[PDB]
Design an enzyme around this catalytic site. Structure first.
Site, PDB file in Angstrom:
ATOM      1  N   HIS A 271      -9.114   6.182   0.261  1.00  0.00           N
ATOM      2  CA  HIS A 271      -7.826   5.377   0.297  1.00  0.00           C
ATOM      3  C   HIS A 271      -7.718   4.610  -0.860  1.00  0.00           C
ATOM      4  CE1 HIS A 271      -4.444   3.383   1.604  1.00  0.00           C
ATOM      5  NE2 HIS A 271      -5.033   2.489   2.290  1.00  0.00           N
TER       6      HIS A 271
ATOM      7  N   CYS B 294       0.988  -1.203   0.009  1.00  0.00           N
ATOM      8  CA  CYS B 294       0.049  -0.004   0.114  1.00  0.00           C
ATOM      9  C   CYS B 294       0.883   1.312   0.024  1.00  0.00           C
ATOM     10  CB  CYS B 294      -0.985   0.082   1.236  1.00  0.00           C
ATOM     11  SG  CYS B 294      -1.455  -1.647   1.762  1.00  0.00           S
TER      12      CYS B 294
END
Length: 368
Positions: free
Chosen positions: A315, A82
């Site tokens: 996100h 990520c």
């Protein structure tokens, strides 16, 4: 003895783009970033994506270069889970700093509204949440202020996915996901694309980009920690965050007291608090205290989530790190949306967390 400056930034709205493709989002961010610099061509392309996957969309660099009409240029994909976005920018700057390429494009892109490792991750962040409050005497309502701050700052951001403010009972009455952790403690999964153009000031003047657009990559840090959670030193300390932050601070020659805002990995409320503790802003156990004392507001001493953070802007994993850098640039340039502008921003910081703390990137941007 070169220097690295961002001269163009661009982004798409973050949201559930059911009718959009990875291409449309990527090329949108790229084109809207090549016009912010007034540029026609780039020298090389670095891509961030942690899977949208037709698998044929695993040769992403060549696809994007074709789709955006860049030519037979070098292109590669950077991935640090990520933190790929956060890492791709860093790799992009090294390219220009190397002296081998003079204009470098970095694009992060994620489409998770496709058209075992999320449940476990949530339960782990939740055990961490119980640890943090039980250990330091905090309550759920205190950490909820992190969501309220993000939803406020995103309400003044046209690009955010969540554009309305909220109250602490809005989060305290959201459905539980874990018993500490609720829907509003957690960032949304979504699509989006962001892009940054990196150069050296010499080529920048050669191309006639005003020094009003230049934001310097002043500090870069990136570090790993163990994947095995039984070999970690502490669960309430993110060690890779500290190591990367130290490297970037030393490289940029600043201290945490010198920097005016922090884009942190508020993927969950506990992570915003722990990120502030690990970035030097707060002492161990006092990360959430800033939230209770309000010092995380835009006008406050330690503004965070300045355009909505991860909880409100969204996100889109693997564009998040590029979004954190475009918003920081826009905060350092004065071109920030009305209502969310860090007062008199000279130094900003960005933090992208990949995995359970296994790969963390920190970048320090300065005005020039």
């Amino acid at each position: 003895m070169r220097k690295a400056i961002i001269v163009g930034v661009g982004m798409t709205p973050v949201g559930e783009h059911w009718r959009s493709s990875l291409r449309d989002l990527a090329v949108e961010a790229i084109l809207n970033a090549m016009d912010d610099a007034g540029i026609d061509k780039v020298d090389s392309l670095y891509v961030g994506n942690m899977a949208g996957s037709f698998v044929e969309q695993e040769n992403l660099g060549a696809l994007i270069a074709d789709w955006a009409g860049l030519g037979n240029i070098p292109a590669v994909k950077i991935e640090a889970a990520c933190a790929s976005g956060g890492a791709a920018v860093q790799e992009g700057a090294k390219a220009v700093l190397s002296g081998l390429e003079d204009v470098v494009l970095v694009v992060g892109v994620e489409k998770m509204t496709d058209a075992f490792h999320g449940a476990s991750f949530v339960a782990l962040n939740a055990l961490i949440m119980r640890l943090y409050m039980n250990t330091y005497g905090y309550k759920e309502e205190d950490l909820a202020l992190f969501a309220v701050n993000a939803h406020a700052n995103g309400a003044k951001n046209p690009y955010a996915m969540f554009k309305k403010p909220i109250t602490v009972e809005t989060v305290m009455k959201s459905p539980y996901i874990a018993d500490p952790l609720k829907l509003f403690d957690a960032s949304p999964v979504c699509d989006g694309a962001a892009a940054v153009i990196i150069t050296t000031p010499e080529k920048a003047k050669e191309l006639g980009i005003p020094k009003d657009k230049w934001i310097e990559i002043a500090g870069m840090g990136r570090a790993i920690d163990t994947i095995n959670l039984a070999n970690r030193e502490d669960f309430l300390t993110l060690k890779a965050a500290t190591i990367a932050a130290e490297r970037a601070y030393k490289m940029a020659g600043v201290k945490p007291e010198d920097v005016d805002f922090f884009e942190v990995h508020d993927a969950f409320t506990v992570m915003a608090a722990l990120s502030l503790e690990a970035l030097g802003v707060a002492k161990k156990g006092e990360g959430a205290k800033l939230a209770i004392e309000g010092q995380i507001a835009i006008d406050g001493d330690y503004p965070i989530q300045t355009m909505g953070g991860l909880k409100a802007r969204g996100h889109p994993v693997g564009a998040t790190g590029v979004y954190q850098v475009v918003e920081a640039v826009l905060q350092l340039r004065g071109e920030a949306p009305d209502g969310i502008q860090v007062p008199d921003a000279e130094v900003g910081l960005t933090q992208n967390i990949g995995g359970t703390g296994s790969n963390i990137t920190v970048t320090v941007l300065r005005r020039v």
